[PDB]
């Protein structure tokens, strides 16, 4: 669960940027660590004091992030036939 506030820098998004603080653990299984991060409104959803929201997949499906080493480029790839065809 999340503790989020509306951002305050400009008006072009004014909203949509939620300064979400939260508890978490860390390396030392015995340790904790609640930090804050800024998220776009499309990656989260609220749940029904200040409003609290988690994530829309957290009742449907698991979540992975991309390992940052790979690219995302569509590559020009020729598609060849097995011979005899």
């Amino acid at each position, epitope marked *: 669960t999340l*503790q989020c*506030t509306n951002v*305050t820098n400009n008006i072009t998004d004014d909203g949509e940027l939620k300064n979400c*603080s939260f508890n978490m653990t860390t390396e030392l299984r015995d340790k*904790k660590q*609640k930090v*804050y991060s800024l998220f776009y409104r499309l990656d989260v959803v609220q749940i029904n*004091s*200040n409003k609290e929201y988690r994530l829309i997949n957290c009742n449907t499906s698991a979540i992975t992030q991309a390992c940052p080493k790979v690219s995302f480029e569509p590559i020009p790839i020729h598609y060849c036939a097995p011979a005899g065809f």
Partner: antibody, heavy 133, light 107 residues
Framework: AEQLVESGGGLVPPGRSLRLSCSAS????????MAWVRQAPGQGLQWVGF??????????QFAAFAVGKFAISRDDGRNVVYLDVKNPTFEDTGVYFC????????????????????????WGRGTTVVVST | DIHMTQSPVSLSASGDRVTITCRAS??????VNWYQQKPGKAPTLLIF???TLQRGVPSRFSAYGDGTEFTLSINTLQPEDFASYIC?????????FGAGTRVDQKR
């Protein structure tokens, strides 16, 4: 630098509700939770209520007399805390201190316990409100 | 409520050694912030958490305790130390303060 400016009125007629203003400066203000301590003149300190930081919920509790009689509201867009004294009484004549909360040497509050243990480092000037006509 | 009865009520000394004992009604093991308000002025934390020196407060002060009955001591007195010294708990809401000690000079 890191200073707190209390204002909001002097002579107020009783019943006519009151707005205060704990104007801050000098630091990143939603790092710290906020509280109100009043003091009747010639008396000891009389804590009114606190309000947590938003990462701690932004939750605001009070003292026993301050249940219903008062209402805290902070504004990080201005770095100011408004205190609402609805139906002021002549009992509520006193100097009104406002202070912040102090993080540790690791810049944190307490994990277990109440959470707030490192006191109120910067004290404001205090505003003086007399509830009389 | 957990009440602080701070002892003494007033104090008189002259470079003397001052000792102030503030007790409780419950077990507050180390959760007391020791304050200083000079008259007509703001408060000033002296010993946070009943034993540890606040940065900016000189080393002539010393607080400690037991769990219920805490004790501040001063070695030694300075002529600007004649102020009101207040114990205050940090164990439980609501915030309760101490009696204070308006200190004058023994004469």
């Amino acid at each position: 630098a890191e200073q707190l400016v209390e204002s909001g009125g002097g002579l107020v007629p009783p019943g006519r509700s009151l707005r205060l203003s704990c104007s801050a400066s000098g630091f990143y203000f939603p790092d710290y939770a906020m509280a109100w301590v009043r003091q009747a003149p010639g008396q000891g300190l009389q804590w009114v209520g606190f309000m947590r930081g938003w990462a701690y919920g932004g939750s605001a509790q009070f003292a026993a007399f301050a249940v219903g009689k008062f209402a805290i509201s902070r504004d990080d867009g201005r770095n100011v805390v408004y205190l609402d004294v609805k139906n002021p009484t002549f009992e509520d004549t006193g100097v009104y201190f406002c202070a912040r909360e102090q993080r540790n040497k690791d810049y944190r509050y307490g994990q277990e316990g109440f959470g707030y243990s490192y006191g109120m480092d910067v004290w404001g000037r205090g505003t003086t409100v007399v509830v009389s006509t | 409520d957990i009440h602080m009865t701070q002892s003494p009520v007033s104090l008189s000394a002259s470079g003397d050694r001052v000792t102030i004992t503030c007790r409780a009604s419950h077990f507050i093991a180390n959760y007391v912030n020791w304050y200083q308000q000079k008259p007509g002025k703001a408060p000033t934390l002296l010993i946070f958490e009943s034993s540890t020196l606040q940065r900016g407060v000189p080393s002539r002060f010393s607080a400690y305790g037991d769990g219920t009955e805490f004790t501040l001591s001063i070695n030694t007195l300075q002529p600007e130390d004649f102020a009101s010294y207040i114990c205050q708990q940090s164990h439980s809401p609501p915030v309760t303060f101490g009696a204070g000690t308006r200190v004058d000079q023994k004469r």
